[PDB]
């Protein structure tokens, strides 16, 4: 009845919410109000509690909240001030912490529950992928919460169940350099002795292949990066499976949004015209000429697949040669022609306009158009649909963003707030 007084009921309500166990509602109320110093302090305390109580999912959610708060602080100005850069790197580091916490939560849920002697192939494949990804992402930071031994032991067991002889040997040597409780020692030396006689050179068909390179890579390659070049991998968070994605940048002169209309008009005009079209020219060149070469080595494999003759791939190869010449990473910058040859569905740009109106934007392209990818913009997380609909059906809450599903109506009413 009185739209002019709002806070006077919210602050006692915020205190009452703090009285009960609904601490996240208190956090969101404090964020709406603006006073976030004590809110951030008590959120850090809750994150410490969740880490101690082995609730690594809640810890990851709290670290994500902390990162969002730091990005909201990044909102301050846009001039090149050192506070912006330090807060941006802090946000990236906190996102890495949240992801490593989620991966450790998964591997700990695996290890704590007694393992099935005959477990599902997909389950153990997912466990192996999660352990390998977590080991690659963390490496040596020995951050707060991870003991670094459970991951190696689980990876060794799942590799012994899934060949993976080189990875098994590497993780077994690491665990030998590591300290283990006496329960798992004689087992680890027995497993090492048994695996010493097994054939080497892994088993193929399991190692990830880096995009924009078509080159094989070992499972453990430092901080989650292919050895062939400098390119970040992308993995679905539900399945921890490598994604066929590449990163590209846009020009700072052309505006992306009139650009969308112009590129769509380019696709529309390039089909009935008698001057042919570059997009179909690329497909026809791929269909006509095909080069596919495979070379075998001990750890690596070089896949010479350059059949698809498209301007994007030609420029990508030229940029890769430039990278080899310079031995340093320069992200690709694209002009209007190449995207004019592109389409609408394949782009999977990640936007952070909700938290900060003008901070950055990242653009990604999928090499394989057959596989569908869904990008949750609330958390900016990539998933394969095929398990995404199943996950949404099982629970109406997205795992990482911890928000309501899009299919259901708005649940955040006054009662929820």
């Amino acid at each position: 009845a009185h739209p002019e007084f709002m806070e006077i009921v919210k602050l006692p309500y915020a205190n009452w919410l703090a009285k009960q166990d609904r601490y996240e509602e208190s956090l969101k109320a404090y964020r709406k109000i603006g006073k976030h110093d004590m809110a951030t302090k008590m959120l850090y305390n809750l994150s410490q509690n969740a880490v101690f109580e082995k609730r690594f999912s809640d810890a990851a959610l709290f670290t994500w909240m902390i990162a969002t708060e730091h990005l909201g602080l990044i909102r301050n100005m846009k001039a090149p001030t050192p506070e912006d850069i330090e807060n941006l790197m802090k946000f990236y580091q906190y996102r890495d912490d949240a992801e490593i916490y989620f991966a450790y939560s998964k591997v700990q849920s695996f290890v704590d529950e007694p393992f099935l002697p005959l477990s599902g192939h997909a389950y153990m494949l997912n466990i192996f992928n999660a352990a390998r990804f977590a080991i690659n992402k963390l490496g040596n930071r020995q951050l707060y919460g991870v003991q670094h031994s459970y991951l190696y032991y689980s990876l060794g067991k799942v590799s012994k169940q899934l060949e993976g002889y080189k990875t098994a040997r590497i993780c077994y040597e690491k665990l030998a350099s590591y300290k283990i409780p006496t329960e798992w020692s004689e087992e680890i030396e027995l497993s090492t002795l048994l695996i010493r006689s097994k054939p080497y050179s892994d088993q193929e068909s399991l190692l990830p292949i880096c995009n924009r390179c078509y080159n094989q890579n070992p499972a453990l390659t430092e901080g989650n990066r292919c050895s062939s070049c400098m390119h970040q991998f992308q993995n679905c968070f539900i399945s921890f499976e490598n994604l066929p994605l590449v990163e590209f940048k846009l020009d700072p002169k052309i505006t992306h949004k009139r650009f969308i209309e112009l590129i769509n008009s380019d696709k529309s005009k390039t089909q009935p015209n008698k001057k042919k079209k570059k997009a179909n020219d690329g497909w026809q060149e791929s269909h006509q000429g095909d080069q596919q070469v495979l070379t075998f080595n001990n750890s690596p494999q070089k896949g010479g697949n350059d059949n698809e003759s498209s301007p994007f791939l030609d420029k990508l190869n030229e940029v890769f040669e430039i990278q080899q010449t310079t031995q340093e990473y320069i992200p690709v910058t694209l002009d209007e022609n190449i995207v004019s040859s592109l389409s609408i569905d394949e782009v999977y740009w990640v936007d952070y306009t909700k938290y900060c109106y003008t901070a950055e934007i990242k653009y990604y392209k999928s090499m394989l158009t057959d596989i569908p990818l869904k990008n949750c913009q609330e958390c900016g997380t990539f998933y394969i649909l095929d398990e995404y609909e199943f996950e949404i059906s099982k629970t109406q809450k997205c795992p990482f963003c911890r928000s309501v599903d899009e299919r259901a109506g708005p649940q955040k009413d006054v009662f929820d707030f």
């Binding site: 305390n45 509690n49 704590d112 992306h256 696709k267 529309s268 158009t369």
Partner: protein
Amino acid sequence: YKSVKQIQNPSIWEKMASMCVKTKRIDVAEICLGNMRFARGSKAIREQKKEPELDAQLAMVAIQLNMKDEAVKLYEQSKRYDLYNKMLQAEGNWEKAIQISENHDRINLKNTYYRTAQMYEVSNNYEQAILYYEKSGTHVKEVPRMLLEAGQTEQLERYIIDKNEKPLFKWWAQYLESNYRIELAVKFYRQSEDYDQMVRLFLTKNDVQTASSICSETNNSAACYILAKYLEMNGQIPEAIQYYWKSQHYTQAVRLAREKGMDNEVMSISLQGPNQVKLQSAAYFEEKGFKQKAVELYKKGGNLIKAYNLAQEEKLYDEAKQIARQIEQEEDQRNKKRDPNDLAGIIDDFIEKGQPERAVPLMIKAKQFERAIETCIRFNIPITQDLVDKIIPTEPAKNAAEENKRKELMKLIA
């Protein structure tokens, strides 16, 4: 310092630290502890240096030099109880810590319960351990873990019978199948309604009939998914495609049907599928001999700009007018809003609608202090000190005009 230098002695050093604690000086206390060469207290100090409250650091020094009641008094004076709660937990009086947390914190009560349960488990009083695990936040995994650590199974049977919980049944059946107790594991899985477990157990012995009956009567997505996974190796492509369609795994079913070359199934399942599978199936039909079905699917598909383009390509007339009307509509919804126009329009329309309370941070970010004050006066927005020193920087003005504007804004706020 110059008087202390000439003598030096560890007892003298600890006495010096005591005087420093009682006189409320920290840096000289740190110097005295450094002269002590007590690594443990120095490590505690360096860990505790990350606190805005110096009272907590002084209490840390006092408990380092074994002054307990002074530390308690300092904790009470600083309005800090969580550190005092940790100290009271560490010394040993658990019930007092429980009462203090209940009447003051209500945040670490679950942690206190878990720590007391762990201490009881160390004391080997398993009944108290399970009781406090029930009082704790989590009890589904702590009880079975500690109960196998003891190795006494039978009371765990009692507990799972009393609780009658699905996760407990699942875990116990997993333990049973670990020790090759197949039948009781099947019974507990049935009590837990994990149909994937029954399906995998039946396919372990290749008993496809019972698994088929169970998946037919339950009609579960994951059970049908794994049954179709088996059928893939069983040479049962049509039933596998049907089960994959029933399990809502559209991509695998549609790609398999396209690979083996079936016609009615692919669009029949794409009509009920998402947009991406519709586009892929329509492109596959364009690859197929009869492009008319591809044109129809594109017409019913989620992409209509390409549908208009191919309508012009096929130069039909009726569907050309239908897609022309649809493209007129699509141009209208696209003209409804742009992305940068979204930013500008949200800002302006947000101002227009009202809600000045969340508009104030935008004006703070845009430095429009005069507009912010005008809005605050307009809607009676309370002006607190945080707003006052956000609008007016605490730094001195570098320019005379800056100071004049600061004074004008300050008197307007007054």
